[PDB]
Amino acid sequence: QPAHLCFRSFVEALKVDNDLVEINTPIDPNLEAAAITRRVCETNDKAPLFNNLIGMKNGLFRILGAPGSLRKSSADRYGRLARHLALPPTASMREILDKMLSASDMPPIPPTIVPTGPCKENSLDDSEFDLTELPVPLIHKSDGGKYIQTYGMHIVQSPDGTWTNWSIARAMVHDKNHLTGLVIPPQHIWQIHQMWKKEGRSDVPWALAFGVPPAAIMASSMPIPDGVTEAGYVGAMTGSSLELVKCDTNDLYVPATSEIVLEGTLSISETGPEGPFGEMHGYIFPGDTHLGAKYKVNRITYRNNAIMPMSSCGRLTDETHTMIGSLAAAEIRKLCQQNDLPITDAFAPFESQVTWVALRVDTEKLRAMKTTSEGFRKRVGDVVFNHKAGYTIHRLVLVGDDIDVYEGKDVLWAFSTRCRPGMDETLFEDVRGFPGIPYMGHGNGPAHRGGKVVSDALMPTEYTTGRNWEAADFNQSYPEDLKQKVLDNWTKMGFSHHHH
Amino acid sequence: QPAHLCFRSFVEALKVDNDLVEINTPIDPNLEAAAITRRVCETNDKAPLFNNLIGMKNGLFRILGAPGSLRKSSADRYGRLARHLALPPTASMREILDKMLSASDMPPIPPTIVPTGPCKENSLDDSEFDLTELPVPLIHKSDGGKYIQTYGMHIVQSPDGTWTNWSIARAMVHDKNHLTGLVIPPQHIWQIHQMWKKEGRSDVPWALAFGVPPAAIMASSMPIPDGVTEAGYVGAMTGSSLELVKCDTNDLYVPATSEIVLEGTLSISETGPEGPFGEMHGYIFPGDTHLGAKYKVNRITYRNNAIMPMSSCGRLTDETHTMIGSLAAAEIRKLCQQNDLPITDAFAPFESQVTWVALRVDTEKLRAMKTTSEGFRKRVGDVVFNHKAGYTIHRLVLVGDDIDVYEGKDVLWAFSTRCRPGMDETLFEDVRGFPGIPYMGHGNGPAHRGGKVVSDALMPTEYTTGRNWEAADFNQSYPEDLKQKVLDNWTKMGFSHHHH
């Protein structure tokens, strides 16, 4: 099966790419696996596959860390993401995000139901598993529980059957047959939960599938629109209908090749302790246990020699940056274009801890709008900060056509030199805020409201007659013939490969 | 003579360090020398010494580019700066800035007058030179003149004789015997000019010395206090009295080993076209000629085989970042401490185009002040933004003790995650602004006023009971024994020098 459609094949792809380290000696799921993975993420090393996990019994489970993290070389920096999508390993960020957006004006390709698949190779009923007995990792030393769920896909469906959502949200072991996890507005798992709570009749039928098709976990991490079933979006993106099998204990459908499947319910009434957790912005607040949603597990099915993917998230660079930030930026780009705003590109700079998005402006189009900074900033911030795709983003930086938004150094240069603090900014206090940013949930103001800004790094003439500067750089401040001469003579004079 | 006390010896030091490329074939001062130097600065390559400059006649002149730019290795990143100061080439930024501040509570060591020196080896009177005939570089393709002066020291003295200032300010050739240049408030060359203009009797006696003692050019680039003669500060810093010779045509004194000396006057009445110029923030606005101060040159003296230092400034990284930003940050650190503010360290991040300074706070001391963010931000911004040392800096970022302000990645992380836009900031509109930042002089508001901000990246408990988080990083989220095990087993497992 192709790597983008089968997790097991994706692991083989990473080996083939010389992007995997198999560790066959005993590794402790209590911190050691996550510490190795953390080190990998901070140094852009090869993904670790822990084949000999202390506590693994009856096939549950091996761990793959860092599934969507960065490679060291520039040329295939984003190769792990490209391997989620059937793209060449050298694919650019622009190409990856375009692939993730391509299904947005395609007819969905609904999934195909098949009678069985590898995820049914083994099963454990209500009398045979105990989640406290599995080798669930402790990811960070102060975490409030063992976070089984960092890279699986929650599956919930609207009461009326018309929308089946796939998404990543964290969850930790509560007891032998329950998890607790984040289920928070405006996320789709929360929106669907709310529908079931209002109906008031039953808990939410649920499944959590780990080691799903890589193209599916990418869509699970993207804020595609309300009401859109991810399976059909992934079908359209990949050009193929995804093969799903029915759960044993409910009528939800899971990818046929899922490594591990939990079946059960998301309670409409109960909660339990959840967190603290070392989160995407790089922090844990030890002891800040909060209450989270409560899941009951009724059944486990799994592949022979099942592999659990794990994100050891925190400081740069991991899945929470590469996928959350970039996929939100992609959706934001499209949302802006659909609202008639002249945005060509969007990216969440890693330097911002993916709390900013830089928006590249087609300034020819801007000039024809005959507008001003104040007006344009307000328009852009109203579109983005009032939408779910803007939830995680607290600062938008508007830049003109000379800036490559995928290059954080150039975004930082433009921000620092073209946006006058205060005057060239509009603050938004009456929008939903993201509590997980420390200055929100652990800060001086309301955790859930405000703290957002549009920073205009367009220069004045970009609105009127055109750019009126040249950069004082090698590229722009010397003629072409001279630049080439310099390059041609560089090593000869005594100064000094793409792949590496 | 020691490298920090003699420019010629400094050039030999750079050779010895394998940090020099001598170019002995013809190089054009029209753009080519500066293009090579620009390329060096953008890639942290070896400094170029142009020994065969097209247009050099009768010993005037060779060029050394990139005298204070960065080296490629981490271990001796700042080695060129260290060679200005007699420090080991591995010296840290903290050590360099401490050396630059050390003279601030030492008695000055006044200079020693000697009867002659190498700078008197050759001379050209009023009938023998023509500045338009020298190989003065065109540094950037749109510059409004040939900028002879990018790394020499202007020498002017108060009318009463009590203060002799040494400073870097740009200047370009106007005609055969005049320059134009920046002389702007609040700079000391401007403050002294104003004194002469108010007296109204004569033009300002002036000298411009190129290839001065490296320790002197560092002080020339630092905002040491009003009224303080740089020569005595450098004497105290180096522990030695600097040897100076008298000018021939006025009673100013120049370093004995200066490569090239211009003697003349700074007019109290005349101006001429100055700029545009590719400046420290990375921009040129072609055609924006402004008027600048006008200098008359009466005499040139110079060393045999004289060398002109040149800064090919603009985008990262050159002297305008390494020296302007870092030396302003050093002075700011001291100013804050002298105003009883609990600041341990300051640095201007390169990522900010040296428009920010990050201030590291001793949070034990902060807690004892029993204050709040609003109050503390206002106090800090009042101290810094009302002082000349704060002139170039438009954003201050307050960070706690866990952040190394010399590491831009960590400053950016803290800023992005700990400072809530708006609420955790205080804007300053009634302070002097820096017009050279594009969003000031070419922006939407007053060029000379406002646009400054204090951004508080201290978390709430840092004011009260202490830090209440741990980072989700390898360092902080795993015990010491486990971290060491991981490191010890890293290459064995299959993953992977300080000098490189």
Ligand SMILES: Cc1cc2c3c(c1C)C(C)(C)C[C@H]1C(C(=O)O)=C(c4ccccc4)[C@]4(C(=O)NC(=O)N=C4N2C[C@H](O)[C@H](O)[C@H](O)COP(=O)(O)O)N31
């Ligand atoms: C990739 C990823 C992702 C994610 C995550 C992760 C990962 C790896 C982890 C590791 C697990 C971490 C975590 C976090 C932390 O940080 O902890 C987080 C947060 C983030 C943001 C926000 C808030 C929270 C999560 C949770 O928990 N919750 C939620 O909610 N979400 C989320 N995410 C996101 C998501 O996925 C999106 O958003 C879509 O979009 C969904 O879908 P829809 O369908 O709804 O649209 N997570």
Ligand SMILES: Cc1cc2c3c(c1C)C(C)(C)C[C@H]1C(C(=O)O)=C(c4ccccc4)[C@]4(C(=O)NC(=O)N=C4N2C[C@H](O)[C@H](O)[C@H](O)COP(=O)(O)O)N31
């Ligand atoms: C290192 C360096 C330095 C500098 C410079 C340079 C260099 C290399 C060049 C290349 C030439 C460039 C230029 C610029 C540009 O960018 O163009 C500039 C600006 C800068 C800022 C500001 C405004 C301007 C200068 C001019 O021009 N002017 C002035 O004013 N200044 C200045 N600087 C600074 C200085 O030096 C300090 O500030 C002290 O401190 C002084 O002293 P006192 O004594 O007064 O204190 N410059």
Ligand SMILES: O=C(O)C#Cc1ccccc1
């Ligand atoms: O209570 C909410 O709406 C929330 C939240 C949150 C928690 C942890 C990490 C990210 C968001």
Ligand SMILES: O=C(O)C#Cc1ccccc1
């Ligand atoms: O007119 C002033 O006060 C000024 C100025 C300026 C010009 C160019 C680069 C930096 C400062």
Ligand SMILES: [K+]
């Ligand atoms: K999703």
Ligand SMILES: [K+]
């Ligand atoms: K602007």
Ligand SMILES: [K+]
């Ligand atoms: K100075």
Ligand SMILES: [K+]
């Ligand atoms: K703060």
Ligand SMILES: [Mn+2]
């Ligand atoms: Mn969804």
Ligand SMILES: [Mn+2]
């Ligand atoms: Mn001075």
